[model samples]
Target: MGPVWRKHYITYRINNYTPDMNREDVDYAIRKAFQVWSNVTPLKFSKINTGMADILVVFARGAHGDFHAFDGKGGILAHAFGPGSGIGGDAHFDEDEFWTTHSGGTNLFLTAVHEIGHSLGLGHSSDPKAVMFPTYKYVDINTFRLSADDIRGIQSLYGDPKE
Candidate 1:
């Protein structure tokens, strides 16, 4: 169990764009990533171009402001703070990693999904198929589904989407 958002409505902003992917693709990819969570919970996410959002997505290299700095290209891919204020719910991607929409290198869609899970207060899971699984595995991006464990965890945090 982790800190959950008290409000169902959430807002996010892409503080900066990664040159690894196109701007429009990054927008769509991130929106799609949020869709996976919105589909299961009552949570609603809105994207803001200006002003601070509940969750901020940022891409940076080593020595970013946070204590958890990126370790070049190989080791740490990305990370996110659990739900709260300011730094909380923010997702940071290591610019050292080449992010793409496909299986090659670090897939932005998949990584975003996992990091966003943390943004929403979900933690690592034992089930390998779960997006929250600590180990990153490549699955067909076009045909991804949440493992039962992932579903149960999120639902517990925010409750039923239908309600």
Candidate 2:
């Protein structure tokens, strides 16, 4: 929305976990998702176990307090706030979705990666190939690469990873 974070570093906290997957798996998925952006820009992320953080990740079912509550399983998978303090930079996932480590179900990594894109001040990209695309699709995680549009988008905010 506005300029990128004035600081190059940010932190996140998994305020809650999804019972659909192993706790470690959830942590891994979130960490890996953050790396997607960190790898492309000088921005760096750290994880916190407690207390407030720049980004807060949580999972809840329908009507979970926030104004934009989850719309059951298929409608709205997840959402995030843009960069700022207070509610800003928080990501909420719809627990109704069968979160999984791989593609048989809703892949946590892919979904988190996309939602985190929003948390990092990115809007949906017109290019479907971009990670910030509005619709979700399972792709080969091992071979996944950011589309040029994604690279350009984040780079415009945080610049390329430092040498």
Candidate 3:
């Protein structure tokens, strides 16, 4: 899993971020990715300026937290937790990976889209084209949008939260 997961009605707060990536840039991607789901359903996400955030987005070095720590170079750049209480809706990135806006390094948008898939209660699929695929593969931001399976998977769990 990545950070944590919270229920539909909760407000998600963006915590401190890593220096590897710009805080504003990461915040934009996170909010946009989350909006994809909210637009389709009744789920609503609001940003809070204070503490008590449902989602804690952070970055750490190898073996910084629980579960699995990332390798210095490659291997699992990050992960996220599905919907749950308390530590839910949280996301963590491996400080080891070369986070970048594009080019040769790992794109934050691409990775966030994938991790958000997991945060929405969607697991990795064997399909390579599926955004929910477990493995980390570099993808062009424009071409890295969600797949049908990814949409269906989440919709199955939360249903059309909107209509």
Candidate 4:
């Protein structure tokens, strides 16, 4: 939650996967996350080779990177590098948690969307109803879309990229 360098254009590639969920599912979740932002922002998010995405997505548990490390606790499910070049926009999820598509486990799709928000030069929103909210809540899969505030925030950064 400090100053981070912003990448005008970012590409993301999966770095690692958890055995619990299919790797393809993880990838799909990431793309879905990016799509949320892309749908409302002028920024075009793409999946490219490693080091190409302004933000890189990875799976880890307990102190994986140079910055804020996971403590294997649910309080901090995941974190991102704000916005920047190289690993600046990268994101890491605590593999210690149950990454699932159901209610009992941490929702991979919802978490990924929140992580991508951090990676896309945005921060947690104060509104608990918003997807960008800092707190984590078990969301209904049937209604896991971005809030108006989220769309507006991304649009402010990149405008409307889509018609």
Candidate 5:
């Protein structure tokens, strides 16, 4: 549905973190989120604290300048762009809703994983079991596993890392 990243290696910078959660947990969630995809494809993601990065991660709310304004508190948790240059791979999280390290409420790890799927050029998966399914679902972060549909779609774009 969109352009895939032409390179195997990618970089991201967290512009800021949401105050709803602590800094360390936010970093942990972001790391594990990328790891989910990197585990399957040759695509590698690195975090850069400075300079221009392939992807930029930010937490914002309302009409915080992306044109696509977020609905406060519940309607939309986040939005991200399909792979390309400029704002294409950036991910924006809605700060109106409560965010959590674990699943007391909205889980950053799960949402970040799904948003990163879009950032990597993965379109919506019809299979609800898939991580790219256009809806949010909760699972134990420690026991997360990609569904078969998620694997096939991602592999179609980036292929096996082992090769």
Candidate 6:
């Protein structure tokens, strides 16, 4: 993984949307996902409709680009890069997955939250309870919160969030 970003303020852009969900819903999911990490760290995130950003969120099918291509619907829901320039900090969601904002189907919010962890320089956690866990499992979004391991991992990189 690369080093942590040198600044607290980070920007992200939704380069594309998935057909599985509404545009507004996708935007909300992306924002809320970023909030999951920002809430526990000093880092803050902002979204822009245009222009370049620290993170670029996109949805693509198998073999879109790069070496890691999406394996249809079942395997590899998404992936992201750690902090750096260019491709770094970008997140790509597998459009083959039926992304949903609510429970059932692949929850966009939950998956986005997980992938954003990678965009923020976090690696997969050994603890299955964590948001950064390697595998995808749907959880009730209404009650979802970062596991202790998640906070500890992010804090190790970004330190405590300023109050």
Instruction: List, residue by residue over 14-77, the lDDT tens digit for candidate 1.
Output: 9999999899989988999999999998999999999879999999999999899899997879
- Candidate lDDT scores, in order, read 0.91, 0.90, 0.71, 0.76, 0.91, 0.90
Q: How accurate is candidate 1 locally (lDDT)?
A: 0.91
Mind giving the per-residue lDDT tens digits that candidate 5 earns over 1-163?
4589998889999999899888999999999999999999998899999999999999998998879999999988999998876799999999998899888889999999999999998888889899998888899888889999999999998888884
Output the lDDT of residue 53, model 5.
93
lDDT of 1 at 145: 91
**Compared to the true structure, candidate 1 yields what TM-score?**
0.97
RMSD of each candidate? 1.0, 1.0, 3.2, 2.5, 1.1, 1.2
Give the Å shift of residue 132 in candidate 6: 1.0
Clashes of each: 0, 0, 14, 5, 0, 0
Local lDDT at 90 for model 4: 82
| Candidate 6: regions farther than 4 A off | none
- lDDT for residue 28 in candidate 4, whole number 0-100: 79
Give the TM-score of each candidate: 0.97, 0.96, 0.83, 0.87, 0.96, 0.96
> Clashes in model 1: which pairs?
none
lDDT (10s digit) by residue, model 3, range 50-110: 8787656667778765666778867788888876775556778887788877646777767
lDDT measured at residue 110 in model 6 versus the true structure, 0 to 100: 92
Q: Compared with the true structure, what per-residue lDDT tens digits does model 2 show for residues 52-151?
A: 7889999999888878778787878899988877888889999999999989789999999898898988988889899999998999999988999999
Q: Which stretches of candidate 4 lie over 4 Å from their true place?
A: 1-9, 49-52
Candidate 2 lands at a TM-score of 0.96
In model 3, which runs have C-alpha deviations exceeding 4 angstroms? 1-7, 161-163
